[PDB]
Amino acid sequence: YDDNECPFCDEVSKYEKLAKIEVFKARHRKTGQRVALKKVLMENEKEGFPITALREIKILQLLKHENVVNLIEICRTKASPKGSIYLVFDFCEHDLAGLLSNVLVKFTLSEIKRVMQMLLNGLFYIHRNKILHRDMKAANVLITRDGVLKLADFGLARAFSLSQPNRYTNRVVTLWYRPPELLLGERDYGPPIDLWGAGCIMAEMWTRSPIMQGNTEQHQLALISQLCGSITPEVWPNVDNYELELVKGQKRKVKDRLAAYVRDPYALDLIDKLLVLDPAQRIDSEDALEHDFFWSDPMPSDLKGM
Amino acid sequence: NNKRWYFTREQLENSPSRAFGVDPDKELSYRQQAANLLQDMGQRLNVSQLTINTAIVYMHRFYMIQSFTRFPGNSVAPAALFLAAKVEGQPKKLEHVIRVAHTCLHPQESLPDTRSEAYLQQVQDLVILESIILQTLGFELTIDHPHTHVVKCTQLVRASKDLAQTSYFMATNSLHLTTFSLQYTPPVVACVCIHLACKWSNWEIPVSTDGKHWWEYVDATVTLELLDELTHELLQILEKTPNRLKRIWNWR
Ligand SMILES: CCC(CC)c1cc(N[C@H]2CC[C@H](N)C2)n2nccc2n1
């Protein structure tokens, strides 16, 4: 019936809803701190409390790090006369997609470098705990008032551990930011699907534009096959253990196409090391973090887009 | 914190079950009984022992907040499983958990119709309590168990097929028969389980050549005063638990 007894669950109404990003902005009615609240659950959910929730909830609790959005707590509603259960996050001023689409806020290479260092370290941490993100897009990169980069939408995030051949989720990520392995239906993949995404998001700092917009899945495969060339056992050893399709007679042009918008020699390379077909030949986070785009002048600077 | 779900002996004395007129010893029996159900139910569902243990921990924490007069052992346990299943990644259909729950508790009675309001309610009650136990625990669902620390520790002190799996069994039983889950940390519990398993399997482990005893490598907050205090508590309750020690008793 009721419970009227709960020490570690809060009532959400302590936070005061303002506006929606079911994701609200909010403020605590005593401390006056800004938070974001995320509703859950539905009539669709006809098999106990959502497990997908419990996955996300459990992940957010596990992940605590500079550049990974914080779950403050999970507050709950009262008996039905808002409703359900809410996930409380430290509010993050701006996302990345909004700052790019926004023509005003323009960054220095100095400011652009740091952004990445926060992200890739962010990825480093989450992968370190054996949790894939599986949804790398510009809108999922949050940034604070101080200028602290965070990551969002760990709804899709899954715990991983490669033992035998394992069976991971097939169609994940946004289709634009989706990588090759996934577009052939790879179901035993690992972190560097994200590290791909990061590359798409990195270039998107300059292009200010989703760099690949494949409507069909082979339209996606086509736009990428312009970049990497033909899909070869040459470039990707044993690419022919899966998948005829199209556009397997191209030639490469990673840097040269987007070169006019980077200008930086060091950066062009970093993009191209993330944007490879083979995941075994797709630069890991550490390799990038220790790369000499991060240790070159002008060096990374703190955010102050204003 | 790391001391929220941990308690003194007098903290256990003044549990919610007490203030609703239920004895200290009677409560333990209310608890011990929830495990046996969780265990039996768990076996019929083919879920892990882990899942079953994790289900027992939720209930052990749960009745530190709620009272058994308020919520029955039998109404909570199928929820604690259904959840623990999903938590530990062996999700069971809600229909499935209800079948089992029913035939356990009501063996003669064949299950009601799946259309009847009877069933559809005993459906809801479960969904209800799942939500309630999430709130009670504050969605703190990840459980470290004393087994993890044993399995490592046994290898790291080359234990036999015997002493190792005996030690594992002691831990499994340190959840059913006692409130060691609520008082002491998993690593401490692990040592108790091995220290008894040794005295029982008549094999006191050699100390390392440094000079540190074996238990010092598992958790440094441990001492022989404490192990010999606790192992005795657990041995006794096992002595009382019928044909329990027979499962680990050597007939040769
Ligand atoms: C895709 C946006 C996701 C939705 C889950 C988001 C957005 C914000 N903040 C917004 C405010 C305005 C900018 N679009 C970023 N926050 N803040 C904490 C958590 C969180 N999550």
Author numbering:
A (entry chain A): 5 to 25, 32 to 91, 96 to 176, 180 to 260, 265 to 327
B (entry chain B): 8 to 259
What's the paper's own text on this?
Herein we report a medicinal chemistry effort to optimize this hit, prioritizing maintenance of CDK9 selectivity while improving the on-target potency and overall physicochemical and pharmacokinetic (PK) properties. This allowed us to advance the initial SMM hit to the potent, selective, orally bioavailable CDK9 inhibitor 28 (KB-0742). Co-crystallization of compound 28 with CDK9/cyclin T1 confirmed ligand binding as predicted in our model, albeit at 3.8 Å resolution. Regardless of the low resolution, the co-crystal structure provided a partial density to confirm our predicted binding mode of compound 28. In brief, the amino-pyrazolopyrimidine core of 28 aligns to hinge Cys106 of the ATP-competitive binding pocket as postulated; the terminal amine of the diamino-cyclopentane moiety interacts with Asp109 in a HBD manner; and the 3-pentyl group points to a hydrophobic patch formed by the Leu156 side chain. An additional methyl to make symmetric 3-pentyl 28 delivered a 6 nM compound. A subsequent CDK selectivity panel demonstrated that this compound possessed a ≥66-fold selectivity toward CDK9 compared to others tested.
Cyclin-dependent kinase 9 (CDK9) has emerged as an attractive CDK target owing to its role in potentiating oncogenic transcription programs. CDK9 is a transcription-regulating CDK that acts as a subunit of the positive transcription elongation factor b (P-TEFb). P-TEFb is recruited to the genome by transcription factors and other components of the transcription machinery, where it is sequestered in an inactive ribonucleotide protein complex (7SK snRNP). Its activation is facilitated through multiple molecular mechanisms, including recruitment of specific transcription factors such as MYC, transcription elongation-promoting complexes such as those including bromodomain-containing protein 4 (BRD4) and the super elongation complex (SEC), and by splicing factors and co-transcriptional RNA processing events. Activated CDK9 within the P-TEFb complex phosphorylates multiple transcription substrates—most notably the serine 2 (Ser2) residue of the carboxy-terminal domain (CTD) heptad repeats of RNA polymerase II (RNAP II). CDK9 releases this paused state by phosphorylating the RNAP II Ser2 and allowing transcriptional elongation to proceed, making CDK9 an attractive target to attenuate unchecked transcriptional addiction to deregulated MYC. Phosphorylation of RNAP II Ser2 is an evolutionarily conserved and rate-limiting requirement for productive transcription elongation and mRNA processing. Although CDK9 is an essential gene and broadly required for global transcription, multiple studies have implicated highly transcribed, short half-life genes such as MYC and MCL1 as being uniquely sensitive to CDK9 inhibition.
